[PDB]
Design a protein around this ligand. Structure first.
Ligand SMILES: [Zn+2]
Ligand SMILES: [Zn+2]
Lengths: 118, 118
C-alpha cells in the first residue's frame, strides 16, 4: 500500500473539458507539491520515491473547496487552492481545485476521506 | 502574457477516464516542474511567476511519446515520461504522458508544436 498520497479535489460543477480539468488538477498538484517540498520536505521525498501517488476526487462548489482548505490548514497539511486567470471562460477569481498533500495517506483522508472519485 | 509554459502530452489511445487522465497529467507536470526547478531554476521561477501555464495536448500512439521525449532531451528541456505502476489497469510500464517544460514557449513548441489540444 502507498503510505503517502496527494489528493486533488476538483469542481465538477464547472464542467471543464477533460483537458482543461487535467491542467487545473496539475496546477494544484505542482503548487501543493512545492509547498510540501519547502515546509514538509521529508513527506515530499517519501511520497516522491514511493511513486508520488495522486487521487482525483470531486465536489460541486467553491464553498466545498474553501471548507476543505480550512480543514487542511488546520491540520498543517501542504495544500494549494487554485485560481487560474488564464481561464477567461469562467468568472475572475473562480477556484477550480484544491490539492491536499503530499502527506501520510491517513492525514490526507482526514480531509478528503469522504469525497468521491472524479 | 505567457512567455513560459509546460505542455503535457497525453495518449488519447489509452482512453483513460477523466480522473485517471488528470492524475497522470499531474504526475508529468510535477516531475517535470521539479526537473526545471533543479536544472533550469530560472525557467521554473519565470513560469511559476506567470501563473505556471499548462496545456494538455495529445498523441494517438506510444511511439509518439518517446519520439517527443528524445527531442525534448536533445533541446535540454525539463521533461518527464510517465509510467504509472499503481495504474495496474494497463500493462506494466505503459507510458501515459510526457510533460515538456516549463521553458520558453517557443522552445516547448519546437517539440510539441504540431500536436492537437486534448
Ligand atoms: Zn532519453
Ligand atoms: Zn509557440
Amino acid at each position: 500500500m502507498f503510505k503517502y498520497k496527494q489528493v486533488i479535489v476538483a469542481r465538477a460543477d464547472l464542467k471543464l473539458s477533460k483537458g482543461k480539468l487535467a491542467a487545473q488538477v496539475a496546477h494544484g498538484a505542482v503548487t501543493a507539491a512545492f509547498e510540501a517540498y519547502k515546509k514538509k520536505r521529508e513527506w515530499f521525498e517519501a511520497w516522491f520515491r514511493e511513486g508520488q501517488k495522486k487521487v482525483v476526487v470531486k465536489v460541486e462548489s467553491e464553498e466545498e473547496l474553501f471548507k476543505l482548505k480550512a480543514e487542511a490548514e488546520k491540520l498543517g497539511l501542504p495544500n494549494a487552492l487554485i485560481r487560474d486567470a488564464g481561464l477567461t471562460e469562467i468568472p475572475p477569481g473562480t477556484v477550480t481545485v484544491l490539492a491536499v498533500g503530499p502527506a501520510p495517506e491517513e492525514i490526507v483522508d482526514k480531509v478528503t476521506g469522504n469525497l468521491k472519485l472524479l
